[PDB]
């Protein structure tokens, strides 16, 4: 049972660290009005979305794997699935928004003065949240427990999300693989590449360029495995379920959840201004 020991140990580690980090970021940003800029609004959005993702994903995704049974009700299944999808979408779109705001501010500093305002940031945050809530609609519809019997004649379930036909299932999964992984990835890579090129053409500049590289590397490493696994299941569920059932998919999900753990660290805790705000806020 060493593998389960590592599994729950890591789940607890990332859970506690992400929760504490998101709470600290939320408190500092909501308290110090001075620390309220266009980028800081998106940082607060990302912190809230990461807390949502942690709470509604991680505790509900280790249980059905340790107990191989879904114990909660249909309402909990539907609500948790809706919230996981919503939080993932909001986090990804907030990251893309931050990358685009930075790219504009560093590429056209005078031209972007027209539209980089707090009101524009509020419009963007509201549009992102509403779009996520609208697009993630099918999950509370088609999420329901599928029952099966175990060797001990005990009842068991599988919260699952299945569209009426496998063709539209594949279409849904391809649509997700596009809009939540591929397009955001290309946009972020292009934006940060332009920022790095403009900033390069000195020891601090190399550090910040490597930070921009780390951001993209962490995003891709955190989000490639889970989307690849979902597409693999959509194309041939049998082989994917046989190969990845149990610990492999649990660890892939943890690798995905680690994005919410790292985002506060890179975006806030490596900033001097932020560290000063944290020291001024907490004793």
């Amino acid at each position: 049972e060493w593998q389960p020991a590592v599994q729950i140990l890591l789940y607890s580690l990332i859970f506690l660290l992400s929760v504490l980090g998101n709470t600290l970021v939320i408190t500092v940003l909501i308290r110090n009005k001075r620390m309220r800029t266009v980028t800081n609004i998106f940082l607060l959005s990302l912190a809230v979305s990461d807390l949502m993702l942690c709470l509604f994903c991680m505790p509900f995704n280790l249980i059905p794997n340790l107990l191989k049974d879904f114990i909660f009700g249909s309402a909990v299944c539907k609500t948790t699935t809706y919230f996981m999808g919503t939080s993932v979408s909001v986090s990804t779109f907030n990251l893309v928004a931050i990358s685009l705001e930075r790219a504009g501010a560093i590429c056209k500093p005078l031209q972007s003065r027209v539209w980089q305002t707090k009101s524009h940031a509020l419009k963007v945050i509201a549009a992102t949240w509403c779009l996520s809530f609208t697009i993630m609609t099918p999950y509370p519809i088609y999420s329901n427990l599928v029952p099966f019997t175990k060797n001990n004649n005990q009842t068991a379930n599988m919260c699952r999300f299945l569209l009426p036909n496998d063709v539209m299932q594949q279409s849904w999964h391809t649509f997700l693989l596009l809009i939540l992984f591929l397009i955001p990835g290309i946009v972020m890579m292009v934006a940060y590449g332009l920022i790095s090129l403009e900033l390069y053409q000195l020891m601090a500049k190399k550090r910040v360029i490597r930070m921009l590289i780390v951001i993209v590397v962490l995003f891709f490493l955190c989000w490639m495995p889970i989307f690849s696994a979902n597409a693999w299941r959509a194309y041939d569920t049998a082989s994917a379920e046989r190969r990845l059932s149990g610990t492999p998919i649990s660890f892939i999900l943890l690798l995905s959840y680690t994005s919410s753990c790292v985002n506060p660290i890179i975006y806030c805790f490596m900033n001097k201004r932020f560290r000063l705000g944290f020291m001024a806020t907490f004793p």
């Binding site: 191989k68 999808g85 046989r242 059932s245």
Partner: peptide, 8 residues
């Protein structure tokens, strides 16, 4: 075997 997982 409770095979498979939840999408996210």
């Amino acid at each position: 075997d409770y095979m498979g997982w939840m999408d996210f």
